[model samples]
Target: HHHHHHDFHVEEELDWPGVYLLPGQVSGVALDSKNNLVIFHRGDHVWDGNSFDSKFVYQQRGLGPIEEDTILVIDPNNAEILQSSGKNLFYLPHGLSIDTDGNYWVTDVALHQVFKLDPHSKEGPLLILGRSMQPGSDQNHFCQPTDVAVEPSTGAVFVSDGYCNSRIVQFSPSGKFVTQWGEESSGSSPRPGQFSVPHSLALVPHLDQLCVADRENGRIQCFKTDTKEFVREIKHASFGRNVFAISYIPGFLFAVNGKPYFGDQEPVQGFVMNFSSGEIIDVFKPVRKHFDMPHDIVASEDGTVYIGDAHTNTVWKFTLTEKMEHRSV
Candidate 1:
C-alpha cells in the first residue's frame, strides 16, 4: 500500500503561558493587523467546574456588571496582556474576528448580538447587529450568534447565527443586512440547508468559500458565498461531539470539539485535519496532553497554534514538533 503516516507534526504545550489576571471564559481567539493576539471570553462565566458540555448548556448564565472587560489583547512573544477592554459591554462573549481594517468584531450569545468595535477609538460601539438581549429569526434578529468571518477584499461579514438559529447570516461592511442562507432556524442533516449547531464560521483565504463548523452535526460545510450553494461537507471525522470552533489555513483545518461531559464516547477535543482531502489527521495517542475541551483555536502559518480551554481558565500553546533530517534515502 502506498501510504504515508500523517503524524508529521508533534505537540507540546509552550512554557511561560500567560498569567490569568482576571475572571472569564476564553471562548474565542483572533489576531489583529499587527499580529497582536486577541481573546474574547465571558467575564461573567466564573464557573470553574470541568466539562462545559451540553450537560451544562441549560445551566449556563450571563455576565454581571462586575464581570467587566471581557476582551484581552496579548503580546504573542511575551505572554503579556497588553490591553483589556469592553467593560460591562458583553453578556456571553463567544466569538471574535479582527477585520482587515484592524477593528474588532465579536459576538454575544446571551445578548443575541454581534458587535463591531474599534478598540483604538474611545467612544462606543461602531456597529451593532441583533437587538440587545432579544432573540428572533428575522434578518435583524439573532438567536445566539457564535462567530464572525470577514472577507478581506470586500469586507462582507458572515456570521454563524448559532445555538438556536441554524443558519448563516451576512451583512455589508457598513453593518447593513445583506442576505442569509442555510438551515433556516431549525434542525440536523444530510440536508444541505439544515445544521445542528453551526457554531463557528471562518472565511477561507480566497474569500471564495465560507466554512461553518456544523457543531452538533459533527461536520464542516463549505458554501459558495456568491451563490449560496452548498458545495460539499467535510467529514470522515473522529470524536463525534459538537464541532464548537474552527480555524483555517491554506491546506489545514484546526477544530476544537465541544463534547458532552457524560457520553458514551471518548472525545478527541482538539484535532488537525487535511481539509482539502477530508482526511483525519491526529497526533499522539492519549491526546489529552494537548487538549481538554478546547473551545477556540487561533493558528498561524508557522505551525504554532493557540488553544483556549472552555471548561478551565487556561490558554495553551502548541507548536509543530521539530525533528532533524538526515540524508540519503
Candidate 2:
C-alpha cells in the first residue's frame, strides 16, 4: 500500500517568562475552542518515585496543594498567558481537556479526582467526581486518574484510571457512574481489555471510538464509546518506547513516546498515523532537540502540534512542512 510521510518542523518553544524558573512540570496540554492552548502543570509539586506508595496511595499527605497556578491559557501564536487560574485547587494536575462548550476538564492524581471547571465563571467547578484525597476503585472514588475525554455530543466523560488501578471509567453527563472496563496486565504481550497504565484519552467521535494511550504496555487501544467493547489496538516498532500521550485530528492520530525502559538511549520522537488503518505515516522529533520527558500532546485544527515535556518544563510546537514517500512492507 502506498503511504505518505510528514516532515515536522519545530516552530517555537513556549515558556513562562514571568516565572523565575521553568514554572513547573508541563504535564498536560490541550487546545481550547478558540484555538488557544491550555496547559495543566504541577506548579511546585512534582510526582516522582517517592510521591506514591507501593499500594498507589499518595505518600505526602500533609504537603498540601500547589501554591502557584496550575492551569494557564496561552496564545498559541506567541505563547502569551491570556488567562491564568487554578491556584490552590489541584494537588497533582495530570490532564487538561476542553469540552465542546469550552469547559475545562482536568484530572488530579494526588487528589484522586476529576474536575470540570468553567474558565470564565467564578462559581468553582461545575462538576466534580471521586473522593478527595481518597483513592479507591469504587464508583465514588478514582485511584490516581490520569486523563479525561468528553463526548462532544452526549457530554459523557471517560477517564483513564491509571497509575494505580489499571482501568477505564466512564461517567454520565451529570456525574453518575456509567460503566468501566480494563484490568491489570503487563508482559511482552497483554490481553485485550487489559491495560498497564491508560495514561491518556482522546475521543474519535467520527469513528465512535475512544482511544487510550496504554503507557506501560506500549500501545494505543480503541474501544466503542457506548458499549466499551474493544475495537482495535495500534502498535508499531516505530514507537521505539512506551507511548506517553495521544491526540486526534481529522484524518490522523498524533502520538509521542517517552524515554525507553531499556535501549541504546534513543532520542524520543512523535508519530503521525492514519487513524483508521493504524498505519504509521510519519515519524519526527523536535528539530535540533529531543523531548526529555513527553507527558502530553495535542494538535490544533490547523494541524499545528504541541507537546508538553515534564522534565524540561517546555511546550514544544511543531508544524507539518513537507511530505515524502513512506514505503510500507
In the order shown, the candidates' Cα RMSDs to the true structure are 4.4, 3.6
Q: CA lDDT of 161 in candidate 1?
A: 89
How high is the lDDT of residue 30 in model 2?
A: 90
At residue 238, candidate 2 shows an lDDT of 68
Q: What is residue 249's positional error in candidate 2, in angstroms?
A: 0.6
Residue pairs clashing in model 2 are none
Predicted candidate 1 versus true structure: per-residue lDDT over 1-329, tens digit per residue: 23455634646444635634444668888877677678887765543443134422322433244256788898877778899898867756888988888888998876789989998777879999988777789989888788999888888999888778878888998888889887642443456667877888867867488888888777778898788888888764464756777788777787777555675365656677787876766542223333556777877777767777666656766665434321111
Residues 204-288, candidate 2: write the lDDT tens digits: 9887899999988779999999888899999887676589999998878899887866654645788888787888766776643
- Score each candidate by Cα lDDT: 0.73, 0.83
- Which one is best on lDDT? 2
Cα deviation at 326, candidate 1, in Å, is 14
